[PDB]
Amino acid sequence: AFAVHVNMERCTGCNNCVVACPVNALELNTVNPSSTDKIYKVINGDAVILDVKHELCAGCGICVDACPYDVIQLSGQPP
Amino acid sequence: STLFPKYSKTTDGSKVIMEQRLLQQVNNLILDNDICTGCGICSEVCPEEAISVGAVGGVRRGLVDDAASIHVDETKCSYCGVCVIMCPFSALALKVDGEERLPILEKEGFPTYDKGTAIDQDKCVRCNICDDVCPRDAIDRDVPLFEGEDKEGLAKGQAVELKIEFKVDDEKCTKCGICGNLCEAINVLHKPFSPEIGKVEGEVIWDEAYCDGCNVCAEACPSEAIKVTRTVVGQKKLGNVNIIDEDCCTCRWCAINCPTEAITVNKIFEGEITFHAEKCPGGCSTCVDVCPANAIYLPTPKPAKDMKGQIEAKIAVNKDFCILCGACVNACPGEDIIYLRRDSVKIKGKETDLFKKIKEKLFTPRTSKVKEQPSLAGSVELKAVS
Amino acid sequence: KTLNMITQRAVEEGIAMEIGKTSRQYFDACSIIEMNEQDMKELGIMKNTNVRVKSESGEVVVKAVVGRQTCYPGLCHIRQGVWANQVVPPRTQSTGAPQYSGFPVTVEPVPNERLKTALELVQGAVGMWKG
Amino acid sequence: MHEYAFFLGCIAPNRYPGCEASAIKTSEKVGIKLLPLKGASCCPAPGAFGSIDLNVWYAMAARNLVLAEEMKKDIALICNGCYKSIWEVNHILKHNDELRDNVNEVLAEIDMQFKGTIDVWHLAELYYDDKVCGVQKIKDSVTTPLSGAKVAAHYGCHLMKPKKERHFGDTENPMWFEELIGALGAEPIQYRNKMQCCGAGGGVRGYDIVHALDITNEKLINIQEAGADAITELCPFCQLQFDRGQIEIKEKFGDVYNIPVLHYNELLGLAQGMSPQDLALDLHAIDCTPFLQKVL
Amino acid sequence: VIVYWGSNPAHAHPRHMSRYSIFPRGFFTGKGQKKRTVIVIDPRFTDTANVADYHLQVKQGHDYELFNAFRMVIHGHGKDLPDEVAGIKKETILEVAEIMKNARFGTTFFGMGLTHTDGRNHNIDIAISLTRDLNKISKWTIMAMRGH
Ligand SMILES: Nc1nc2c(c(=O)[nH]1)N[C@H]1C(S)=C(S)[C@@H](COP(=O)(O)OP(=O)(O)OC[C@H]3O[C@@H](n4cnc5c(=O)[nH]c(N)nc54)[C@H](O)[C@@H]3O)O[C@H]1N2
Ligand code: SF4
Ligand code: SF4
Ligand code: SF4
Ligand code: SF4
Ligand code: SF4
Ligand code: SF4
Numbered sequence A: 001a002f003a004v005h006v007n008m009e010r011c012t013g014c015n016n017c018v019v020a021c022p023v024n025a026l027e028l029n030t031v032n033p034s035s036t037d038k039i040y041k042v043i044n045g046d047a048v049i050l051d052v053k054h055e056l057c058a059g060c061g062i063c064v065d066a067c068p069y070d071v072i073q074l075s076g077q078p079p
Numbered sequence B: 001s002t003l004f005p006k007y008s009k010t011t012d013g014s015k016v017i018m019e020q021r022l023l024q025q026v027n028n029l030i031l032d033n034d035i036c037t038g039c040g041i042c043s044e045v046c047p048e049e050a051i052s053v054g055a056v057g058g059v060r061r062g063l064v065d066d067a068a069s070i071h072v073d074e075t076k077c078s079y080c081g082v083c084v085i086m087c088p089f090s091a092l093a094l095k096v097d098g099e100e101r102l103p104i105l106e107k108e109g110f111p112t113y114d115k116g117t118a119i120d121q122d123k124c125v126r127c128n129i130c131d132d133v134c135p136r137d138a139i140d141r142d143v144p145l146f147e148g149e150d151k152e153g154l155a156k157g158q159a160v161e162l163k164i165e166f167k168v169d170d171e172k173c174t175k176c177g178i179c180g181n182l183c184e185a186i187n188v189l190h191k192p193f194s195p196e197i198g199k200v201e202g203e204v205i206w207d208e209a210y211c212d213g214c215n216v217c218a219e220a221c222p223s224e225a226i227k228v229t230r231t232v233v234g235q236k237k238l239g240n241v242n243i244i245d246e247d248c249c250t251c252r253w254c255a256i257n258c259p260t261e262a263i264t265v266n267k268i269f270e271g272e273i274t275f276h277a278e279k280c281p282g283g284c285s286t287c288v289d290v291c292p293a294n295a296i297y298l299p300t301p302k303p304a305k306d307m308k309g310q311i312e313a314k315i316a317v318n319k320d321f322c323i324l325c326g327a328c329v330n331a332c333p334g335e336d337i338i339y340l341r342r343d344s345v346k347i348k349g350k351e352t353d354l355f356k357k358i359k360e361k362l363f364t365p366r367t368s369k370v371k372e373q374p375s376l377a378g379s380v381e382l383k384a385v386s
Numbered sequence C: 001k002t003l004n005m006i007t008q009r010a011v012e013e014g015i016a017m018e019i020g021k022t023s024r025q026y027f028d029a030c031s032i033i034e035m036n037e038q039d040m041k042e043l044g045i046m047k048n049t050n051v052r053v054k055s056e057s058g059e060v061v062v063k064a065v066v067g068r069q070t071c072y073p074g075l076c077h078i079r080q081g082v083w084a085n086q087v088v089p090p091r092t093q094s095t096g097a098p099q100y101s102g103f104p105v106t107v108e109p110v111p112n113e114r115l116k117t118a119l120e121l122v123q124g125a126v127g128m129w130k131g
Numbered sequence D: 001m002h003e004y005a006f007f008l009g010c011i012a013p014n015r016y017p018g019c020e021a022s023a024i025k026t027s028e029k030v031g032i033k034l035l036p037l038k039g040a041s042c043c044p045a046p047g048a049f050g051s052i053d054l055n056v057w058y059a060m061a062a063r064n065l066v067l068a069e070e071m072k073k074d075i076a077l078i079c080n081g082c083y084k085s086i087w088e089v090n091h092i093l094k095h096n097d098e099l100r101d102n103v104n105e106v107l108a109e110i111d112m113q114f115k116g117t118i119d120v121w122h123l124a125e126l127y128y129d130d131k132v133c134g135v136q137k138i139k140d141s142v143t144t145p146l147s148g149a150k151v152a153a154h155y156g157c158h159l160m161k162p163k164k165e166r167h168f169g170d171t172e173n174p175m176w177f178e179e180l181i182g183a184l185g186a187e188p189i190q191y192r193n194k195m196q197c198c199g200a201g202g203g204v205r206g207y208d209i210v211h212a213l214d215i216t217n218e219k220l221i222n223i224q225e226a227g228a229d230a231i232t233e234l235c236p237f238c239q240l241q242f243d244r245g246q247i248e249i250k251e252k253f254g255d256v257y258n259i260p261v262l263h264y265n266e267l268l269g270l271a272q273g274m275s276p277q278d279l280a281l282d283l284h285a286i287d288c289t290p291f292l293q294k295v296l
Numbered sequence E: 001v002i003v004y005w006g007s008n009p010a011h012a013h014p015r016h017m018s019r020y021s022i023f024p025r026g027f028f029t030g031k032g033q034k035k036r037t038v039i040v041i042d043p044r045f046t047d048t049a050n051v052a053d054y055h056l057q058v059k060q061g062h063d064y065e066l067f068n069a070f071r072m073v074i075h076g077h078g079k080d081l082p083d084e085v086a087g088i089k090k091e092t093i094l095e096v097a098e099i100m101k102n103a104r105f106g107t108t109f110f111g112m113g114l115t116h117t118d119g120r121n122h123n124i125d126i127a128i129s130l131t132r133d134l135n136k137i138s139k140w141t142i143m144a145m146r147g148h
C-alpha cells in the first residue's frame, strides 16, 4: 500500500513501467484474474499513477528497476 | 511540557537505531537492515503492536533508501525484547545501557527458539559444501587453507598424514642442483668451492613437510640416485566445522546436502506452504529475490522437442528448504498465489501465557492481498484465511 | 586532445525537433557537448560553458556539459542536428554513409562567445543570413 | 503552468540581472510562468522611503499593486524588502478602510483605483508550496548535483518577520530555506546567530556604513567559522550588502573572506545547468570561481 | 536472449522495449523479462545498458574485431583469442558467447554503432555472418533498427 512518485519532467513515455508492474500484469496474464485495477497508464506521454489512494502497490521495485532513465522514486515510509 | 523521555529514531548507516533517552538510562532497539528478511514474525509477535512491515521487495532489492524493511513506533515500543528473541535471523538487538542485555531472558520469562545446530566433528571432513550452500553467512569451517586458492596451510602433502622415506647415493651425487631445482623439499647446499679439493661437494637435504610420492626427481636425477614410498594413517580432519547458532535459520540445505550426514538442524516452524502457479503474473520474481532460504525457484523452461504439450509453471517452492518465514507472502504483489500456515514452533524454555498468545498469533493462516485499505497506507496488510 | 567523437540521439532531442527545428527547445536540446568529467578537468572546461569543437571539416561553438550516459575517458558526443553536422566530416568510404560517429576533433575552452542558432548556422553557411 | 506577474524591483534588474534571468528560466522549467509587470517602479523601499513618509509609501506600493490588479494576476517577488512593501501594503489596505480611502483619493489624480483583489507571493514561497512547484519538483528539475558544497543560508528579516504579521511560522530556527538548498544537492550548514540582520535594512546602509558593515561582519565571521563556501540569500538588498560590503570591509577594516554571495535563483540556475556567463556571475564583487570549481 | 549491438532503444525507439523485445509476457515467454538475457554493446553506458543485464563497453570503432572474436569462439577454438579484444576481456567474451550458444531463440538488433563507423557495411555483414553461424546450434535472427 506504498506510494510511488513519477518525475514527469524526465518521463519519456517508454511504457516499460506499465508493462512491468506485476499489479498491472494481473488482468491479462493470470488465470481467473483477481483484481483488474492498474497503477500506471501513459497519458499524454508521461506515466500517470491511477493508484491515487495508495492501495495496490506492493513495494516490489519491478517498476523502479524497469524505467531506463531512473525517474520513479519508491517511498517505503507511510505517506 | 516535559522533555526528558526523548524518543529518537536515527538511521546510522545500515542500522536503524531506535532509542529512548533518560538522564542516565537509555534503551536502544537496533535493527540491522542488512540481515532483515522482511518476514513479519516480528510484527506478529510484538506484544505492544508497534512493529509494522514496509516495502519488503524494494528494500530487499536495494531500490528503496528512505526506509527499512520494518518500521517500529519507538513511542509505543516497551523494550521487552520479545521481537529480539522471536526473530528467526537475528537482525534485531536490544541494548539497555550500552550492552546487549535481555532482562526477560535474564529472569527466564520467555522461551527461545531451539534451532538445535551441531556438527559432529568426528564425521565432518572439512568439505566446503556446507559453507557453499548455506544461504545465510552462518557455517564456519575452521580449516587451514592449503594450496587451493592460497599458500599452503600446512602443505599439499600434509593435508593428508602419509609415510614417505627418501635416500640418495652419496656415491652418485654429482651435486647438480636438479634434485632441488624441482621439488621445494630438496635443498642442495654447495659448500664453498676451494682449489684444495678442486671438486664440487655438498649435501642434499630433504624435508618431509613438502614431499609427495611424485617421484619426478628420481628420474630428473641424471645419475640414478634416489628412492621413495607412501601410505595414509587413518584420518586427517585438519580443523573443525561447526554452525554459528544465532545466524542459522533451520533451512536444512546443508544438512540435506552434507556428504557425511554430520549436521543436525531442526526447523523452528512446521506447517505447509502452497504456490498456485496459475496466478503469478509472470515477471515478478520478488518472492524469489526475497526468500531467505532460497526455497523458491523459477522452474526452468524446457527446450523444444521436450515440452511435450506441457508449457511450464511460473513459480514453485521447495518444501524441504522453506522455513515458513513469511517474506514471500509479505512481498508478493499478487492476490492469493501463496498460502502460509505454521503449525508448531519448536522451543526450549517452558512456556508462558504470553507465549500461548504469541503461538495463536503466529499460527493463523495468511495469504497476499491486492487493494488493502488506504488508512494504513505505508505498510502491509494480508488476508485472513478462514 | 585528439579526443575521438561520436554523434547520436536523445529523447529530449527528438522531442525538440518535433516541437520545431527553429524552436528554443531545439536550440537547448541540440547545442550540447556531452563529454567525460575526467576529460573536462584535464582540458580545463568549466561545466556548462561554451567550447570550440573544431574538426578537420569545420568548427562549431557548443555548450559543454556532462552526460549521464557515461562516456569513457577520451570520447565526446553531440546530439545529432545542425550543430553536429556543422562539424561532421563528409567522408563516405564509397558507401554513402558519412563519418557520423568516430571522427577526431580538438576541443578549446572558449567562453564569452555566443552560440549560433540553427537558422544562423545553416543560412550563413549557404550565404543567406539576412537577419 | 501557473502564471504570476513578476514585480522585479530595483536591484535585481539594475545590478544583478542574472538573478532575474535565472528567475524566469528556472521558474519556467518548473511549472511557473513569470509575466513582466507593465511599468512597475521601485516598490517604495520600506526603509529608505518608509522612514521619510508612510503615506507616500502607501501610495506608491498601491500603484504597484493596481498595475497587477489591472493585469488580473498575482504578484511574484524575489526580494524580501519588495515583499515587505508590496505584500504588507496589500494586506494593510485590504483591511483598513480609512487608509484605503486616503490612498484612493491620492490615486484618483492619476485615474487609478485600489480594490484589493490579488495576492503577493515570494518566489521561494512558491517553490516551497506543494500546490505550486514543491521541493520534490525542484529536486526533479535539478540536473547538476552541486554536491560537495557547504552553503550557508541567510533568510533576511522582511520575509519572515514579524511572525504576528506573516504566515511562515517559526522565526527562531526555520529550516524551509535549508530544504530548498538541500534539494539542489548542496548541504546547508548551520552557523551561530543565523537569523541575524545583515545590517542593510532601514536605510542604515546609507546613513552609517561603518555600523552596517560591523553588523555584516559579525555574520561573515560566523559563516566563515562554520565553513561555508557560498551564502545563498532571497533578497537583493542582502546580496548587495554581503557582496559590496565584503569589499568595503576589506578596505575599511582588514578582514578578508572571499565568500561568494548568490541568490537562490542563481543557485537554482546553476543546478538546472545554466552557464555562469548566462548567470552573469562576473557582475559580483566577490569572485565565485572557487565555488564554481567545487560544484563543477 | 536479446542483443542490442550498437543501438539505444531507450532514446531512439522509446516503446520498443515495452512492446516487442523485453518486458512483454509472450506465449512461450510467460515469465516475461525475468527469463530474458539482455546484452547491450556500445562504448557509452546508455539507458539501454541501465536496463540491461550485461554490458560490453567496447572501444568505439573496434566492433569488427569484437565480432571476429565472437565468431572464433563460436567456431570452437576460442582459446586462440588474445588476452583482451576491443577493450573487452576474454572471460567476459566467453561468458556472453556461452549465453548465446545456450539461447533457445536469440535476436540481435543493430544501429548507428555499426552503420555509421569504420567499415560501414563490413560491420553489418560480419554481424550477419555471426548470426548465420549461430543458427548452427541455436536459432538467431539479426534485425535492423530502422528509423523512420
Ligand atoms: N528522439 C529521437 N529518436 C530517434 C531519432 C532522432 O533523431 N531523435 N532518429 C531515428 C532514426 S533516423 C534512427 S536511424 C534511429 C537509429 O537510432 P539507433 O540506431 O538506435 O542509434 P543511436 O540512437 O544513434 O545510438 C547508437 C548507439 O551506438 C553507440 N556507438 C557509437 N559508436 C559505436 C561503435 O563504434 N560501436 C558500438 N558497439 N556502439 C557505438 C552509440 O554510443 C549509441 O549508444 O533512431 C530513430 N529514433
Ligand atoms: S512497486 Fe511493484 S506493485 Fe508497486 S507500482 Fe511498482 S511494480 Fe507495481
Ligand atoms: S518507465 Fe520511466 S520513463 Fe518510462 S513511462 Fe515509466 S516513468 Fe516514464
Ligand atoms: S528478520 Fe523478520 S522477524 Fe527479524 S527483524 Fe526482520 S522482519 Fe522482524
Ligand atoms: S521490543 Fe517488544 S514492544 Fe518493542 S518492538 Fe520488539 S516486541 Fe514490540
Ligand atoms: S558439509 Fe558436512 S562434512 Fe562437509 S564441512 Fe560441512 S559439516 Fe563437514
Ligand atoms: S639431481 Fe641426482 S645427481 Fe644431482 S644432486 Fe640430486 S641426487 Fe645428486
Ligand code: SF4
Pocket: B182, B183, B184, B185, B186, B210, B211, B212, B213, B214, B215, B216, B217, B218, B228
Ligand atoms: S618425490 Fe617429488 S615431491 Fe618429493 S622431493 Fe622428489 S620431486 Fe619433490
Ligand code: SF4
Pocket: B130, B133, B134, B135, B136, B138, B139, B243, B247, B248, B249, B250, B251, B252, B253, B254, B255, B265
Ligand atoms: S542449517 Fe541451513 S541455514 Fe543454518 S547454516 Fe546450515 S545451511 Fe545455512
Ligand code: SF4
Pocket: B273, B290, B291, B292, B293, B294, B295, B296, B317, B321, B322, B323, B324, B325, B326, B327, B328, B329
Ligand atoms: S519459500 Fe519459505 S523461506 Fe522462502 S520466503 Fe517463502 S516461506 Fe519464507
Ligand code: SF4
Pocket: A022, B279, B280, B281, B282, B283, B284, B285, B286, B287, B288, B315, B331, B332, B333, B334, B337, B338
Ligand atoms: S508469487 Fe508473488 S512475487 Fe512471486 S511471481 Fe507471483 S506475484 Fe511475483
